[PDB]
Amino acid sequence: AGASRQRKLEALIRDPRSPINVESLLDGLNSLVLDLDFPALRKNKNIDNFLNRYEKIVKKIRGLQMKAEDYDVVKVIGRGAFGEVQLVRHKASQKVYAMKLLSKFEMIKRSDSAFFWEERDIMAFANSPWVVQLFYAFQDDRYLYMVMEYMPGGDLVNLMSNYDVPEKWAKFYTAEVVLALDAIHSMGLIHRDVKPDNMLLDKHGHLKLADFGTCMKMDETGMVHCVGTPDYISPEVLKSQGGDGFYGRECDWWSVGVFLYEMLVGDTPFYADSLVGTYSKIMDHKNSLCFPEDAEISKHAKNLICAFLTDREVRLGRNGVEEIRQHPFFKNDQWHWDNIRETAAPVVPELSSDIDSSNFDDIEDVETFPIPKAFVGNQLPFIGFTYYR
Amino acid sequence: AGASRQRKLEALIRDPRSPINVESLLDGLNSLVLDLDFPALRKNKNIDNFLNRYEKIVKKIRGLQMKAEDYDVVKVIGRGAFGEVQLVRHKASQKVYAMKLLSKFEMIKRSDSAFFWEERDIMAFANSPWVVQLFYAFQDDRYLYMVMEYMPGGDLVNLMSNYDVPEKWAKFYTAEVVLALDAIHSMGLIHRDVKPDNMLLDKHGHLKLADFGTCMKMDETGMVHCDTAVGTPDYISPEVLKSQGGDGFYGRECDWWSVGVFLYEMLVGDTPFYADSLVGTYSKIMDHKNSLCFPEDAEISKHAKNLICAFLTDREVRLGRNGVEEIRQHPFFKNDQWHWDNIRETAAPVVPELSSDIDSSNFDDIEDVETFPIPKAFVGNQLPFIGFTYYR
Ligand SMILES: COC(=O)c1ccc(F)c(NC(=O)c2cccc(-c3cc(C(=O)Nc4ccncc4F)ccc3CN)c2)c1
Ligand SMILES: COC(=O)c1ccc(F)c(NC(=O)c2cccc(-c3cc(C(=O)Nc4ccncc4F)ccc3CN)c2)c1
């Protein structure tokens, strides 16, 4: 009946995962207002009269909703392709978060614009201690904001540059990465850009993955038809960039092997001065993968590294994560796969307060959209991005 | 804290009086989809990706929401400037309604496009038995719809044309118009288009006002500021005629001129300033001091004649400056069938003979489409109708 219909649609609006939830529909009207309030378009009677009604309530609404002015910015802890990351303190609650800003301009211009949906879903609804939790997602006219839990231990790029990593440490950080990727794979997602920059460390020095712009949802077969600095990117993913090309979750396990090599060796296995150099070496990995004479690595460590860095058809982890996690290398008298994250981490950070950012390096140093004549609708891609947990 | 804000905003979305209630925000999404889904606009990647996402969910919502296909059209019972009015039966409930279609194309074309807000607000939130009530307001691509209560008795244009009205009946219906107009004034609204076309009679033959397109919201004093003259030529007050030519300040008195014109029509059988051209009618209305006169062959009583000349005078001396009180205590109204407090619970003059719930014998038959052009740029023809949807 009509009563049954209104019950059904009210379910579609209260659903926080729905595209027509109240935050999306409020995003829709706010995106419509921002996209229309220009003097050139206001010559149109339909557009000017529409703004006359809603201009008042839209300014009110935007005041009540969560915004950047609510958060005191303590420091900038990272920079990235489409923006930056800030250490922030929410003023009303005094709680410390890490807030990621992604530029709407840069996303629209350089033309990626769909990566942030999966990132937002994964961080909100992953519900895994291997993935950084998102608390709030919101936006203004220039930026998207993602308010995440603050990983105060820094990343593994910092850990490797400040410590010469022994093999017992390498077992730990590799095992945690394996578990973290298994978490993502189990959500039906291929990471396809795993690397120490995206591997953060929590309060107790335990790993959580932190960037998911590259993530993509798998098929029934498990494959994913569809960019970057190629250091950690597998051969098949590299070949795939040339036109079409299928690949699966094994591409992430290549990256793990690259990551294992780096920790024990100190350089990436396919390092070169140019991108074409690195690309070229990654394709000729059968001949170009080699260990230095003066880099004391064990038989099992070398065996695992060689297991991962091979063709996809015989790589470690086609048959499953099992054979990876029962490789001899991981045998130890400290932790087990079922209890690793509650055991003592190799490196616990010594921090003084809730805003201690000492394990992050310092960051040093504008343009936005042009005023349009016609309707371009730049805000339309960002409708339904707002999320309040 | 943030808790105080998210409760304040939640107050705004749940309220059906609010412009940002959920019904309106759905219209915001729906209108955007309609206004972008065209081949040339999909050449924009921003537009085409947005419509690739939402079109499916927007298609499911459109089927769930109330629509015209829910109703059986029994017979078309009226026509007006911006659309028609149909007699409908809701399929799921079998309940009879009169629903008014209003063409979005013609409203944008002839440019008015905001009269319907106060029409909707009155019917939705009047709660007076002098005003036809709106159960459901909705829309689609072409029409705004308003599902009202069916008034099977017909309008007063039909009553005066069928029956030859005596003054005992005219006391009654004029009284009901005054109480109806007083109600509308008591909501801060000048009707400024009172006439027998817009007076409908219910199951029992008691009046209800039933078109509010010309209606406008008053000031803190009671006056209104309007540049354009409005209303049907025959019943337009000289002050509203004179408002066309520049600055026009005037209060609720303009309605009583029309009640004046209305009473003259009932007893005399023709409208007081009739002319074969509209140009002549405006010339007669402006010269009402000399032009207003009765035929000799006419049996209108002195108290009847005293009331009409009381109404059809300049606003400075018109019966209505000192409120509704002075209208009610005129000797024409004084009788022993009804009091003012109980008039609508007394025996009406013309109780209709109604066989069935779809009896449209009081209304007459009707006899005899164009649409928007496919735009190249963003034009936004659905933006004036965002927030029109309403469910009781
Ligand atoms: C190169 O082409 C690509 O593959 C590609 C394509 C699309 C993309 F969106 C991106 N990534 C970004 O644009 C991007 C923008 C801004 C910040 C980051 C970023 C954030 C974090 C973080 O949240 N840390 C963090 C988390 C919690 N507590 C403290 C923290 F410090 C970590 C690392 C990074 C760099 N990965 C990434 C990359
Ligand atoms: C001349 O310019 C204006 O003053 C002006 C400006 C803007 C406007 F929107 C309009 N009105 C319309 O366009 C319009 C369109 C379609 C139907 C009507 C209309 C409807 C009714 C009705 O609801 N009856 C009714 C009610 C309940 N149960 C059964 C009924 F039968 C009565 C009378 C009428 C004519 N007034 C009016 C007029």
Beta-carbon contacts of A63 under 8 Å, excluding residues fewer than 6 positions away, are: none
What is the 3-class SS of A165-181, one letter each residue?
CCHHHHHHHHHHHHHHH
Q: Facing residues of B96 across strands? A: B89
Tokens of B386: 């965002």
A167 vs A243: CA distance, rounded Å: 40
Residue type, B171: K
Distance from CA of A248 to the nearest CA of B (A): 26
At residue B225, φ and ψ (nearest 5 deg) are -110, 110
3-state secondary structure chain A: CHHHHHHHHHHHHHCCCCCCCHHHHHHHHHHHHHHHCCCCHHHCHHHHHHHHHHHHHHHHHHHHCCCHHHEEEEEEEEEECCEEEEEEEECCCCCEEEEEEEEHHHHHHHCCCCCHHHHHHHHHHCCCCCECCEEEEEECCCEEEEEECCCCCCEHHHHHHHCCCCHHHHHHHHHHHHHHHHHHHHCCEECCCCCHHHEEECCCCCEEECCCCCCEECCCCCCCCCCCCHHHCCHHHHHHHCCCCCCCCHHHHHHHHHHHHHHHHCCCCCCCCCHHHHHHHHHCHHHHCCCCCCCCCCHHHHHHHHHHCCCHHHCCCCCCHHHHHCCHHHCCCCCCCCCHHHCCCCCCCCCCCCCCCCCCCCCCCCCCCCCCCCCCCCCHHHCCCCEEC
Question: How far is it, in rounded angstroms, from Cα B303 to Cα B171?
Answer: 11
C-alpha A58 – ligand 2 centre gap (Å): 33
Cα distance between residue A161 and residue B358, in whole Å: 86
- Joined together, the tokens standing for residue B344 give 């609508």
B81 is known to lie in a ligand binding site: yes
Whether the CB of B153 sits within 6 Å of ligand 2: no
Token pair belonging to B387: 């927030």
The DSSP bridge partners found for residue A208 are A200
Crossing angle (nearest 10°) for helices B167-186 and B302-311: 30
Q: Is the CB of B78 under 6 A from ligand 2?
A: yes
B84 marked ligand binding residue: yes
Question: What residue has token string 């000192």?
Answer: B322
Given the DSSP bridges, would you call strands B134-139 and B390-391 parallel, antiparallel or unpaired?
antiparallel
CATH classification number, A1-154+351-389, choose in 3.40.630.10, 3.30.200.20, 3.40.50.300, 2.40.10.10: 3.30.200.20
Angstrom CA distances, A240 to A114, A212, A251, A280, B299, stand at 19, 19, 11, 15, 98
Q: How far apart are CA A383 and CA B33, in angstroms?
A: 13
- Residue B47 is which amino acid? I
CA-based Rg of chain A, rounded to a whole angstrom? 24
**Closest Cα partner for B198 from B272, B133, B132, B127?**
B132
CB atoms within 10 A of CB A139: 23
Q: Which CATH architecture describes the domain B155-353?
A: Orthogonal Bundle (1.10)
Q: How was this structure determined?
A: X-ray
User: Taking CB atoms and an 8 Å limit, are A64 and B6 in contact across chains?
Assistant: yes
List own/partner pairs for A214-219 with CB under 8 A and 24 or more apart.
Answer: A214/A115, A215/A115, A215/A118, A215/A119, A215/A122, A215/A184, A215/A189, A215/A190, A215/A191, A216/A118, A216/A189, A216/A190, A216/A192, A217/A118, A217/A188, A217/A189, A218/A188, A218/A189, A218/A190, A218/A248, A218/A249
Dmax over Cα atoms in chain B, in whole Å? Answer: 79
Find the closest chain A residue to B14 by CA distance: A22
Q: Which residues have CB under 8 Å from B391's CB, separation 6+?
A: A6, B23, B66, B136, B137
At what angle are helices B22-36 and B45-64 packed, to 10 degrees?
130
CB-count exposure of residue B11 (10 Å: 0-12, 13-18, 19+): exposed
Name which of A47, A374, A381 is nearest B50 (Cβ-Cβ).
A381
Pick the catalytic residue: A27, A155, A182, A193?
A193
Plot region of A299 (φ>0 → left; ψ -120 to 50 → alpha; else → beta): alpha
Q: Does domain A155-350 have CATH number 1.10.10.10?
A: no
Task: Say how far apart CA A324 and CA A321 lie, in whole Å.
Answer: 5
Q: Is the CB of B348 under 6 A from ligand 2?
A: no
3-state secondary structure string across chain B = CCHHHHHHHHHHHHCCCCCCCHHHHHHHHHHHHHHHCCCCHHHCHHHHHHHHHHHHHHHHHHHHCCCHHHEEEEEEEEECCCCEEEEEEECCCCCEEEEEEEEHHHHHHCCCCCHHHHHHHHHHHCCCCCECCEEEEEECCCEEEEEECCCCCEEHHHHHHHCCCCHHHHHHHHHHHHHHHHHHHHCCEECCCCCHHHEEECCCCCEEECCCCCCEECCCCCCEECCCCCCCHHHCCHHHHHHCCCCCEECCHHHHHHHHHHHHHHHHCCCCCCCCCHHHHHHHHHCHHHHCCCCCCCCCCHHHHHHHHHHCCCCCCCCCCCCCHHHHCCCCCCCCCCCCCCHHHCCCCCCCCCCCCCCCCCCCCCCCCCCCCCCCCCCCCCHHHCCCCEEC
Q: Is B79 annotated as a binding residue?
A: yes
> The dihedral of CA B145, B146, B148, B153: what is its sign?
negative
Q: Which pair of tokens denotes residue A206?
A: 């335990």
CB count within 10 Å of CB A263 equals 23
Q: Among residues B6, B38, B7, B50, which one has the least CA distance to residue A384? A: B50
Q: Is B155 exposed, middle or buried (0-12, 13-18, 19+ CB in 10 A)?
A: buried
Topology alike, domains A1-154+351-389 and A155-350: no
Asked whether B32 and B57 are in contact (CB, 8 A), the reply is no
Comparing CA positions, the residue from B65, B85, B60 lying closest to residue B75 is B85
The verdict on B57 touching A (C-beta cutoff 8 Å) is yes
Nearest to B256 by CA among B304, B200, B327, B176: B327
Q: Angle at Cα B259 formed by Cα B256 and Cα B265, nearest 5°? A: 150
Contacts of residue A289, Cβ cutoff 8 Å, sequence gap at least 6:
A269, A270, A306, A309
Question: A81: Cβ below 6 Å to ligand 1?
Answer: yes
Long-range contacts, B32-38 (Cβ 8 Å, 24+):
B32/A28, B32/A32, B33/B58, B34/B141, B34/B382, B35/B378, B35/B379, B35/B380, B35/B381, B35/B382, B35/B383, B36/A377, B36/B378, B38/B374, B38/B375
Task: Return d(Cα B53, Cα B31) in angstroms, integer.
Answer: 15
Residues 290-349, chain B, touching A (beta carbon < 8 A): none
The candidate with the shortest Cα–Cα distance to B139, out of B31, B276, B54, B243, is B31
- Residue pair A215/A123 in contact (Cβ under 8 Å)? The answer is no
**How far is the C-alpha of A380 from the C-alpha of A28, rounded, in Å?**
8
Among residues 86-115 of chain B, which lie with CB inside 8 Å of chain A?
92-93, 108, 113-114
Active site residue A361: no
Other Cβ atoms within 10 Å of B134 Cβ, number: 23
Closest Cα to residue B157, out of B203, B198, B210, B194? B198
Q: Parse chain A into domains and list their residue ranges.
A: 1-154+351-389, 155-350
Cα angle value A97/A99/A100 (rounded, 5°)? 150
**CATH H-level, domain B1-154+354-392: superfamily:** Phosphorylase Kinase; domain 1 (3.30.200.20)
Instruction: State the count of interchain CB pairs (< 8 A) between A and B.
Output: 109
Closest C-alpha among B330, B350, B346 to residue B338: B346
Q: How many whole angstroms separate alpha carbon B91 and alpha carbon B229?
A: 42
Backbone angles phi, psi at A48, to 5 degrees: -65, -45
B46 strand-pairing partners: none
Specify whether the CB–CB gap between B1 and B363 falls below 8 A: no
Q: How far apart are CA A202 and CA A152, in angstroms?
A: 6
- Give the integer Cα–Cα distance in Å for B142 and B106: 10
**Residues in a beta bridge with A99:** A86, A147
Dihedral angle sign, alpha carbons of residues A165, A169, A171, A172: negative
Q: For residue A389, what are its two tokens?
A: 């947990």
Check CB contact of A13 with chain B, cutoff 8 Å.
Answer: yes
First to last CA, chain A: 33
CB B360 within 8 A of CB B108: no
CA atoms within 13 A on the CB side of B380: 25
Please state, in angstroms and rounded to a whole number, the distance separating the CA atoms of residues A55 and A59: 6
B192 is known to lie in a ligand binding site: no
Separation between Cα atoms, residue B351 and residue B336, nearest integer Å: 19
CA of A60, closest CA in chain B: separation in Å? Answer: 9
- Could you tell me how far CA A160 lies from the centroid of its own chain? 21
CA distances from A384 to A110, A117, A141, A213 (A): 21, 9, 14, 18
| C-alpha distances out from residue B115 to A75, B217, B274, Å | 54, 11, 28
Put simply, the answer to whether B46 touches A70 (Cβ < 8 Å) is no
Angle among Cα A74, A75, A79 to the nearest 5 degrees reads 145
The answer for B 174-213 residues in CB contact with A (under 8 A) is: none
Report yes or no: B365 and B114 within 8 Å, Cβ to Cβ.
no
- Is residue B275 within 8 A of residue B281, CB to CB? The reply is yes
Cα gap B342→B96, rounded to integer Å: 28
Residue B367 neighbours by CB under 8 Å, 6+ apart = none
Expressed in angstroms, the distance from the first to the final Cα of chain B is: 34
The token pair at A369 is: 């959209």
A220 C-beta neighbours (distance < 10 Å), count: 6
Asked if B61 contacts A20 with a C-beta cutoff of 8 angstroms, the reply is: yes
Q: Dihedral through CA A75, CA A77, CA A78, CA A83, nearest 10?
A: -30
Catalytic residues of B: 193
Q: Is the CB of B148 under 6 A from ligand 2?
A: yes
User: Are B110 and B102 in contact, with CB atoms under 8 Å apart?
Assistant: no
Query: How far is the C-alpha of A20 from the C-alpha of A24, rounded, in Å?
Result: 6
* B2:A92 CB<8 A: yes
Cβ atoms of B191 and B93 within 8 Å: the answer is no
Q: Which amino acid is present at B357?
A: D
Sheet containing strand A143-148, edge to edge, reads A71-80, A83-90, A96-103, A143-148, A134-139, A387-388
Rg (chain B; Cα; Å):
24
Q: Strands A199-201 and A207-209: what pairing? A: antiparallel
Q: Is the Cβ–Cβ distance between A70 and A99 less than 8 Å?
A: no
Q: How far is the CA of B198 from the centre of ligand 2 (A)?
A: 7
The Cβ of residue B164 has, within 10 Å, a number of other Cβ atoms equal to 9
Whether residue B33 contacts residue B54, with contact meaning beta carbons closer than 8 Å, is answered with yes
Hey, what amino acid is at A7? R
